[PDB]
A paper describes a structure:
The allosteric regulation of ADP–glucose pyrophosphorylase is critical for the biosynthesis of glycogen in bacteria and starch in plants. The enzyme from Agrobacterium tumefaciens is activated by fructose 6‐phosphate (Fru6P) and pyruvate (Pyr). The Pyr site has been recently found, but the site where Fru6P binds has remained unknown. We propose that the ADP‐glucose pyrophosphorylase from A. tumefaciens have two distinct sites for Fru6P and Pyr working in tandem to regulate glycogen biosynthesis.
We hypothesize that a sulfate ion previously found in the crystal structure reveals a part of the regulatory site mimicking the presence of the phosphoryl moiety of the activator Fru6P. Ser72 interacts with this sulfate ion and, if the hypothesis is correct, Ser72 would affect the interaction with Fru6P and activation of the enzyme. Here, we report structural, binding, and kinetic analysis of Ser72 mutants of the A. tumefaciens ADP‐glucose pyrophosphorylase. By X‐ray crystallography, we found that when Ser72 was replaced by Asp or Glu side chain carboxylates protruded into the sulfate‐binding pocket. They would present a strong steric and electrostatic hindrance to the phosphoryl moiety of Fru6P, while being remote from the Pyr site. In agreement, we found that Fru6P could not activate or bind to [name] or S72D mutants, whereas Pyr was still an effective activator. These mutants also blocked the binding of the inhibitor AMP.
Numbering used by the authors:
A (entry chain G), B (entry chain H), C (entry chain O), D (entry chain P): 6 to 420
The structure:
């Protein structure tokens, strides 16, 4: 009768550096990276927990967390303990130990047992905080209880050649995990469906009592790298009962999303592509859906504005997504995504451009196939996208020709 | 030393019907009308109160106030009494008398003395809630105390020809009010500056104890129409000391506003004009200003989206202001202001259009010189602005050719 | 898999006058009456909705609603539409019609169909807002869908002699409702257990569109008094499928409540008793429970204080419940319940006293067996509970000797 | 005309360890210590800022700050940047530098200039976060601008023998500071009033642009201990213009406070004394004042309860201050102060006790002259205050005989 989410706590792992995002994560952890016009990556897992009815949330942070923690303080501020709600931001710090850094994803939870236990949740839902996806976690909770698993593991069903970069679960007829392989060159297929493999999402459901004991087990073992994927879960698949949960069974698709949507935006190319795809006529991700909404930190913002329309300049956007507090003054935008606060000035042009909040585009600048970091001021007349060798020397250039542009790159600029 | 706003309470008169806005105010009071892709009209006086440091606000409502009350409840919800802050919504209702109607603007304060006296504010700032303007009321409060006035009245300095439509204050050299005239055919000129007259704003500062006594006198006087403008102030200019405060002295102008901005948007033409002027290259009102911000009710909204770009259709906006959650799909917008939630569809065209929230524009519709009421669905292929005779039969058409369009008029439609 | 409350809207009927509470409800509807030391009666149903997972709430108000509506505005302010939550305060007002009065409890929902249908909830949970009880509405929802009922009705299982004051449901062996009788002299018994009758709590679960259809037909029938209990529900038991849900199956009992707790505090004796019973060593209602908490409007308040300990005066409380911001200065309290803000002064005595917020007790006053209304100032030396004849002349005195004391009564006082 | 607080930012130094409070500050910094029944010490400076109209606040933390940060996050959560309000929590950490420690109170501001400069406040109000006092900083701001000072320093006026423990300002006839001495053996007296000296409160007003340069200068000086009182202020007194502001000129006294109140609660005795003094008939600090309120983090909490009244046990409090959610079950309290959540059980007695939140007193325990730390569980039958030598072996006992009791101390216990 009662939904199990009433008795669950979501615990989000948000310490991931995202080192392949290069300068995009030099000053902020990957869960803090802006995505899709407004939110940050972490808001997706957070919103999944909220919309699934989980109203105790803990977030473990580590690497470069000041921007992430400030976002969480200001955006996720509406939980009240009187209502059996809680939002705990849990950085590694001189608190219960000297340390100041978590030893691994397991240690991220283990060090905060004294926070969890007063709440006495029946269940723990462990979440990667660095992916973009919508999912109703009540489904996994139900499967976990009914299957008697020690751990239920969220898995994507992917073509085996795509699984070579994931931690892959090897399952039997009834989706019980026989073995776990980190990045198999030839991923094991699903029995009776070997064109596909189950790739771990880093979503784990436990009974709290079991998890605490296993965290304590783990923390005593010197063999352990203190990691869910490499230590906790492999021990259980061997000695206990681990079961896979398939993302397709619990993904929340809107009427305007043709397939289950999950993205890890792990490379500059992948991050550019996921954002720019939102400019499509029929985008894979429906950012206009209100049935499974993404909460985030947002301020009252004025509308977007388009000015100038003469023989020489026209401020206008085609095949583009433009946020509030954007003033497109005499600037031509095509196939671009603009976050809030952008100022694009006369005779400039943006094409195939992902523009993070509060960027300024100087008069006459022309930028194609770029990601412009938050707050960058683009000098008047800067050309990007016309000279690959010049662009690669000045900026971080992808082999597929995307330039990531940061303020530090701009400050160094000559010819 | 201490600012006088700490000891003031703002009391906003928000019962105004705005009869000349015709069907724009059929189901909402004038202070509830949307303005500027920014806020509702009432939010300007409320934000002026807030930014001036007044932490006690009351709002008297009357004519058709459901939409207005719900906006106040949801938008103006962050005052806490334990911080000596209060926000009181005061509709005429069976709480102290049967009535269910306020007899006038003086009565709207008078019936609520039992709300005011427990707060014991030293000063009352009585405000009209149906005008768009920015003003720092600390200045009026200083002038009032130092002048020793019984009432201090905010006044616009305007050419006398334009003053024929206002309550007009006749003053001596000291800016003390020696007479008041309701709509003078020949407005009294300011001494030494005869080309201008002081036109009342309906902004009044009193010592609370004095006002409470003047309201009690007024509730007894059978010759009184129970109106601040026509009863309270004239009695004081007669028997006490009334002093005029000029708008230009305390108007808050941003660096991008060439002159003090005040608008009463009292007619459809004036409402259309003030909104459409926000699409100018250098607008009179700076809605991007952050130094004197306008607080309002706002939700997390997705960005605006423009799609399609081929031989036959292109979704794009030129010389226009576009709010979030607008999808401009194959539609051409020019010199238009769109509030949130608009959906404009393929081959439609808007020009010189003020489009309130959640309007839908059907394919192939072409509309020029229009105000479209909140939530209207414009039928595919509807043409407005081509045939004044037909437009005037179907719609509320001003002499200058603005068509106000409501869903009730759409529902009646044929050829 | 997904809880049904996600898809439900709770709709609280809060127009009740509670006329048998006499002067306690002369300026406030019954759901606004204070109960238990802090909350108001309406907060119980509201908190049940919230704790059950229902995040769309409507509250219909009518009789003397200013205090109620201010309570809802300031207390129930944390719902956000972006999260698919809503809290709508729905007074009878000149809005969709002139009226200024709901024709009945069915009409209170019918008039507001235009507010419900934009939310399109799958289920409606219609609640009476004038009872004190705790209940998980997910159980009723499941029974309602699983049974295929047209309406599921919440029912107290009570001894038949106690059911003569209730509207009683006659059921068959499957708890299907075969008849409904308003206040039967000899209430029909439950089959196979005739010592008990099922007494209607005025809680009704419907499929939304079935209810919209029953509401519309009811508004059309001139036979109808426009009432859930005597119009909607009788027709369904006759023409459709009405099923009873027993309170015991879904009451939320803390470990410290020996039985399911339900109270209608319909009379001054019952209100006094239910409150004073909280001073017991083992109270029937556990106001210290945090597993099913009651949300309300609460301000930051200083602690309670006890002053003076000498020959002739000692401020102290025995067998009593004392809220914050109470200063017990030389006053003896025994078996009393004090809401916040009380000032009891030297040489006064309270026994068997229910004391609503911000009451003042003057020096030397002695009061026994009383309910003291919000904000009453008790004159120095007043004696209540000594002389029944004099007490009944001065105050509202019950047959059993409880005096309800209002400020209007105090104002009239001599000897 | 315009108050100066509109353009100030308050910056609270809250990294103080409070070493002399011993185990009371072993797991929290001094600003996080509970005081007076509800608030925490830091809430006084924060409330002074808020009530003075300062809407931008920064709080620098360092030593053991988890509890403090969580308090700030949950309690001080109502500032919105759109209203030009801001509340920044600034712990030393990896962000702008590796360090993760502040080199001193000046470096606590210096490391965060990049947070300050975007706001561009005209004035900085630097505050000590570890003192209990009320003060209207608009007075100090007015004095600063009008005097032309480089730094205006808040100062207590105390008898000279008392000043020997303070940093003392030597002034001339016009309250200009001519020397500064750290703990003078013989404190320089006030000219014309040699019985008194000016003791620095560690409150400093600057022009922001001045301060930013003085900090940059300080961050270059290798002879600098990076301290406001030790390096910044003496430098200015020497080469610039430092002016003293006397606390009596801007202290906020309620009508029930016989003198300006300031306490630093630096020792266990001083902490115990300031709290127990609140049980007085006429307390020096008025915690019931509403004119200058102290905001803090508070939850909805049930009332206090007193039970049992027979010949062997009576739950009651005399000359005591008792917070909500305290159940006094057969326990006798006298001259004690209880924070929320205490459970005192049958036959126990508390005298002269300061009892922090959520303490449980076991049956038959008898405790006199104690501070009991947050959450301590006192064993049944424990006796404290009877045997000085035993009490000092078990607990932290002051020379004056106050025992500080923590759970670690209880956990060691036998006889």
């Amino acid at each position: 009768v009662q939904p199990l989410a009433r008795d669950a706590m979501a615990y989000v792992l948000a310490g991931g550096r995202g080192s392949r995002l290069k300068e995009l994560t030099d000053r902020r952890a990957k869960p803090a990276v802006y995505f899709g016009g407004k939110a940050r990556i972490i808001d997706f897992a957070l919103s999944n927990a909220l919309n699934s009815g989980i109203r105790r949330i803990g977030v473990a942070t580590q690497y470069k967390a000041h921007e992430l923690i400030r976002h969480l303080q200001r955006g996720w501020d509406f939980f009240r303990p009187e209502r059996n709600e809680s939002f705990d931001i849990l950085p590694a710090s001189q608190r219960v130990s000297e340390t100041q850094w978590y030893e691994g994803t397991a240690d991220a939870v283990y060090q905060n047992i004294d926070i969890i236990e007063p709440y006495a949740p029946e269940y723990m839902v462990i979440l990667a905080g660095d992916h973009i996806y919508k999912m109703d976690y009540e489904y996994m909770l139900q499967q976990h209880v009914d299957s008697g698993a020690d751990v239920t593991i969220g898995c994507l069903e992917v073509p085996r050649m795509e699984a070579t970069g994931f931690g892959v679960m090897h399952v039997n007829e009834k989706d019980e995990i026989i073995d776990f392989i980190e990045k198999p060159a030839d991923p094991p297929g699903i029995p009776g469906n070997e064109g596909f493999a189950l790739a771990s999402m880093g979503i784990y459901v436990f009974h709290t009592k079991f998890l605490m004991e296993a965290l304590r087990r783990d923390a005593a073992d010197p063999t352990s790298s203190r990691d869910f994927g490499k230590d906790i879960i492999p021990y259980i698949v061997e000695h206990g009962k681990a079961v896979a949960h398939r993302f397709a069974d619990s993904c929340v698709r809107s009427d305007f999303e043709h397939e289950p949507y999950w993205r890890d935006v792990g490379t500059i190319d992948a991050y550019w592509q996921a954002n720019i795809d939102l400019t499509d006529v029929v985008p894979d991700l429906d950012i206009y859906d209100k049935s499974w909404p993404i909460w985030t930190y947002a301020e009252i913002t004025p509308p977007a504005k388009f000015v100038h329309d003469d023989e020489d300049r026209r401020g206008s956007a085609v095949s583009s997504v433009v946020s509030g507090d954007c003033i497109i003054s005499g600037a031509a935008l095509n196939r671009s995504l603009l976050f809030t606060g952008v100022r694009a000035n006369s005779y400039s042009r943006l094409e195939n451009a992902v523009v993070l909040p509060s960027v300024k585009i100087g008069r006459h600048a022309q930028l194609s196939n770029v990601v412009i970091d938050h707050g960058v001021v683009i000098p008047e007349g800067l050309i990007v996208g016309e000279d690959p060798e010049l662009d690669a020397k000045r900026f971080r250039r992808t082999e597929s020709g995307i330039c990531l542009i940061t303020q530090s790159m701009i400050d160094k600029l000559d010819l």
